[PDB]
């Protein structure tokens, strides 16, 4: 069947910047059947543009995109801060639907250092024969960050559980959790446990750790 291809998959912007996406086609297709969709966080998507130029209801006048032939686009003139979502483009076929890949936009703000707080395992997991050292990293910009685990200087990369967050609408920062899960005997063979935060905003990775002081 017909297949579509998008560009770019990821692109960021600031309020006051004018952006334009692409939906590339694999064969020449008329204008009267090609549709746009917008999906926010945890929302079932909504129709956006019917028939490649005409807008739908509930759409402000800052939205247009046109053309013909084998290449189409969607241009936001004065981009708001609520336009950080994922788009889709559709084309109808002989008897099949075919959507696109996905087109995500991001909001930029100022740089910051990550805020780091490491937690010890609770007492009830120690009764269960296990241990789990969690090192939270919340409210940082941008998304790209790398962390390490140091057990008495030894860089351990085994038993690491990482998961990032959606871009917040409150401040446009990011958050992350890194988990060092151990066993009961492994947690008592060593003393120091160190999680660090390597980021482009500070050339020295700050150290937030804990000892076995009453532990």
């Amino acid at each position: 069947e017909i297949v579509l291809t998008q560009s770019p998959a990821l692109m960021a912007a600031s309020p006051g910047e004018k952006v334009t996406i692409t939906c590339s086609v694999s064969l020449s297709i008329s204008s009267s059947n090609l549709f746009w969709y917008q999906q926010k966080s945890e929302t079932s998507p909504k129709p956006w543009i019917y028939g490649t130029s005409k807008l739908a209801s509930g759409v402000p006048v800052r939205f247009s995109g046109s053309g013909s032939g084998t290449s189409y686009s969607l241009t936001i003139s004065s981009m708001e801060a609520e336009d950080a979502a994922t788009y889709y483009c559709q084309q109808w076929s002989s008897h099949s639907f075919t959507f696109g890949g996905g087109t995500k936009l991001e909001i930029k703000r100022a740089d910051a250092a990550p805020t780091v707080s490491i937690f010890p395992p609770s007492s009830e997991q120690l009764t269960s024969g296990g241990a789990s050292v969690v090192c939270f990293l919340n409210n940082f910009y941008p998304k790209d960050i790398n962390v390490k685990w140091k057990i008495d200087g030894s860089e351990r990369q085994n038993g690491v559980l990482n998961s990032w967050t959606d871009q917040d609408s409150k401040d446009s920062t990011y958050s992350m959790s890194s988990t060092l899960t151990l066993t009961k005997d492994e947690y008592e063979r060593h003393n120091s446990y160190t999680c660090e935060a390597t980021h482009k905003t500070s050339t020295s990775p700050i150290v937030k750790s804990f000892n076995r002081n009453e532990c």
Binding site: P45, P120, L161, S163
Partner: protein, 228 residues
């Protein structure tokens, strides 16, 4: 009063069936066509089925042909979809969609539903374990204090985590879970004022309806591990 909700779904072993539904209210249901669109969790959309208004002409993609079953009943004002002999790449999100123009098939889609998760896997249904968190110490004991709650070892998706039956919702960071070795692991954190805690007692509320697990844990302010 145009509304579209769903039902069904859950966990099916590879080798089973599942029979969904779609509730439609507000328009005149005997003058549109209706279609199921699926959403993969890897952020990609895909089409499943469609059916005209009268219920006599169906269409199917070739990748799933002869396996799914779609039907309509006009008086009941609801939509069906019948599955049999599933596979593993059906672990995704489903939707129920109405076409745009009247009497039509295959134009656009204006009003969808909201979603229903279906996962087919070879794991076993378990119950979560809840662990409260508290910091070790603090230099100069500043006013910014953070507490956490750990939910590890449950199956399947989803689980519900609130704080004091949903009292506080500011300064909280809910994290997406990660599946490791047929066990889901979820973590959460909340940052409050050091005058609020331990003066105000908070409790991590965890609701796991897939195993009917309701475990509530509160934070002990760093009891030292000593014994005379």
């Amino acid at each position: 009063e145009v509304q579209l909700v769903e039902s069904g779904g859950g966990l099916v072993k590879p080798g089973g069936s599942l029979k969904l539904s779609c509730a439609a209210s507000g328009f005149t249901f005997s003058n549109y066509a209706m279609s199921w669109v699926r959403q993969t969790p890897e952020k990609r959309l895909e089409w499943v089925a469609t059916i005209s208004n009268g219920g006599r002409y169906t269409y199917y993609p070739d990748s799933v042909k002869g396996r799914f079953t779609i039907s309509r009943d006009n008086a009941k004002n609801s939509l069906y979809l019948q599955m049999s002999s599933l596979r593993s790449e059906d672990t995704a999100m489903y939707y129920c969609a109405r076409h745009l123009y009247r009497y039509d098939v295959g134009g656009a889609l204006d009003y969808w539903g909201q979603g229903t998760s279906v996962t087919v896997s070879s794991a076993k249904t378990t119950a979560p374990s809840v662990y409260p968190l508290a910091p070790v110490c603090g230099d100069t004991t500043g006013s910014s204090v953070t507490l956490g709650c750990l939910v590890k070892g449950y199956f399947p998706e989803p689980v519900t985590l609130t704080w004091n039956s949903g009292s506080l919702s500011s300064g909280v960071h809910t994290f997406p879970a990660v599946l490791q070795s047929d066990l889901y692991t979820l973590s959460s954190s909340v940052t409050v004022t050091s005058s609020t805690w331990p003066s105000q007692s908070i409790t991590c509320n965890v609701a796991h309806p897939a195993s009917s697990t309701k475990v509530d844990k509160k934070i002990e302010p760093r009891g030292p591990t000593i014994k005379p």
